[PDB]
Symmetry: D2
Subunit: 237 residues, 4 copies
């Protein structure tokens, strides 16, 4: 199976798989059962922003999410990612719906990774920033129901012609280039990601969420990963 | 055939195809016969640096090359690249040798492209920086004789075990991700590239040169493009 | 007197000093009488974005301005800025009103300057980005009526408690650090600036405009530079 | 007195003030008596590179130092800098010698600070990079014996005409612009710094070291802070 590290914006509480009884943000290391969560006061229909940061010296994966006019939510987990992920990875965004649903619209996505070696300073870096997504966004690998270009946005899950979100949907977008997160000569490795999202639902119970993830380069959507599995995991182990 | 825009660091004067009678830097638009050249005082065995810049407002492709302790050489050509290249391209480095030879070693390579739309500011960007190249540089598409990892460098053309450059060699490295240089909503598009190189030869007449190029995404080395054709063009038209 | 290079967003046509008979964007080199202008379809009450770019190889100062859902306006002028400005400068934003008035609100401002020498690659750079302005923005030198912190914005000219713009006002904001735009070893120098603005007026004839400018480090608002002089020039010569 | 946070590259072991019995890297919070140290295999006459990183979510100040062909040394300390430093600070480099001496040459210095608010994404940033220092580096506040321009470098402490380091010297360089490290709306604040240095001595016992520091904006060299006090502290408390 794939190897997944993710920060989840989980909109629907699945208490039998360890979710708290409210929408939450979480850090997922090879399991949908988060290693750490924090309460997230998700706002239906408002544009929010999530930030994810990590470096190989501190070995702490941290995330912060907020909305304008509102307090933030944050979560952190101590994990050496070089012991979890391979040296080369792909990065992406994933989202899903099940019998409960919501739009999983991405309005912007940015990412910066750095590998500093011991050669004279010696910086190696990758950076990308999307503030619009066109109909043929060639530097994105779209998987499942993910589409780009509708209103210049990235719609991770299926949305009908009228704008209504559909249930039983799963979609992901991965940056085309592989990303180097470890090197034998690296003295410090770091990454930061930011994305802005619009989660909207006609219902009082939206589902299922959006995640920023890092995976083996050949990662694909696991069979049956709609709903609670967020398009990331093949089961709830 | 491929569509090529390139800045050439041409070390060997081929006067019958329009080269001046000395090493030179040139701007190549769909032909090895440069649209513009400038004299280049190439130094055998020294590390040099080339810079390339362009934006869609000014529509002028410019380049500067220098060595420490030395004056620079520069060349510019007015060209609307949106009338030459497709909307999506790949960027790369190419080099060749023929009966005359030289090492075509790249020590660093950086690139930044930006597409600013008319939406609130609205920046879209790609940036990469290589200051080392490992044995398995997965974000580089290596073509021909190009290799990475020998002394942490990118060797565009073949070098023997002892370090001697080989003749009749051609190699290229392209960044893995496609690059977006035009968009219908873009109000300004720009790119800048920098690379550091070491051209060394045991001979008084090194050949053939190194080029930074932009091409259709599916670009490949043209058959018979060793020597004077710089791994970029199928003929000298 | 000060030495000023500016890109003006001129909202009021002063035909006796060479302005065209409509709102326009212009490039100003040591005079309020622009060396080059282009028609600007200014929209009262909408947030717009201006971009300014320049490099020492091409020696062309260019600007583009737009609004969402609208076409852009652009202007360019060939000028070697090293022949106009001193080696060290300050950069800023200026605005004014006269008997006619408007708000001159800045919502964001970013700037990047680079000096690349001939030493191994050798990059020198300054970058700043403001997306909010607090009450005590210590890295900004505020001049005249300029204030920060009202709604997290930079108000270049005076606005009343109720939000109405006031006439006969002039204000500027300069970044605190001096900026290096030339060096004897520089092989390429470049700068880019972006700002987002909101110009609103209760009147059918707003005045007078906003400009991005570059000046001697000790630049101050010239006496009597309200209205048509944009807080930049001491007279209309 | 000033408020100082610093990462010290301490070349001389002063055991009575808590230094370990070997050259070391340390994190200093309001005292020359480091809160945390690690052994540093300092190499006389070789160019080395230090990296410093911090963010307000993790609240961990970390540093790594290395030389080409050598292993790194690293140190980390959990500290909420918003509880130590004021909201606005200046950043700089400091160095000293006493009866024992060394050159404290800086070859490059870069710094990036970011304040991300909860407004739509909302990035605020400062970045500077020096790869050369000229004779009149106006964006640097030089203090004490610090000079720029000799071989394009920043010499923190006094060096004679012949190149010999002098004892009883203290010098600092601070970036001219104040830096904003906290804001009421900031959801994440971060900074990273890098500098390359050349510490050389004719003696088997070099002294005293170089530090990257953050201080109140009006920070000045404390009286009698030569030698073991690194130009940062007024005493050894
Ligand atoms: Ca759930
Ligand atoms: Ca040739
Ligand atoms: Ca006017
Ligand atoms: Ca000591
Ligand atoms: Mn969950
Ligand atoms: Mn040629
Ligand atoms: Mn005008
Ligand atoms: Mn110590």
């Amino acid at each position: 199976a794939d190897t997944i590290v993710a920060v989840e914006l989980d909109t629907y509480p699945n208490t039998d798989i360890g979710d708290p009884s409210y929408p939450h943000i979480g850090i997922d290391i090879k399991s949908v059962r988060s290693k750490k969560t924090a309460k997230w006061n998700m706002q239906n229909g408002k544009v929010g922003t999530a930030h994810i940061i990590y470096n190989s010296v501190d070995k702490r994966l941290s995330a912060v999410v907020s909305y304008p006019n509102a307090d933030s939510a944050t979560v952190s987990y101590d994990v050496d990612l070089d012991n979890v992920l391979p040296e080369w990875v792909r990065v992406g965004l994933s989202a899903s719906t099940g019998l409960y649903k919501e739009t999983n619209t991405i309005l912007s996505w940015s990412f910066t990774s750095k590998l500093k070696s011991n050669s004279t300073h010696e910086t190696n870096a990758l950076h990308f920033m999307f503030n619009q997504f066109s109909k043929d966004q060639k530097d994105l690998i779209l998987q499942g129901d993910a589409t780009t270009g509708t209103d210049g946005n990235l719609e991770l899950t299926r949305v009908s012609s009228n704008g209504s979100p559909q249930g039983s949907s799963v979609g992901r977008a991965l940056f085309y280039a592989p990303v180097h997160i470890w090197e034998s000569s690296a003295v410090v490795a770091s990454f930061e990601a930011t994305f802005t999202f619009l989660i909207k639902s006609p219902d009082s119970h939206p589902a299922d969420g959006i995640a920023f993830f890092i995976s083996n380069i050949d990662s694909s959507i696991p069979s049956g990963s709609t709903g609670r599995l967020l398009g990331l995991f093949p089961d709830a182990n």
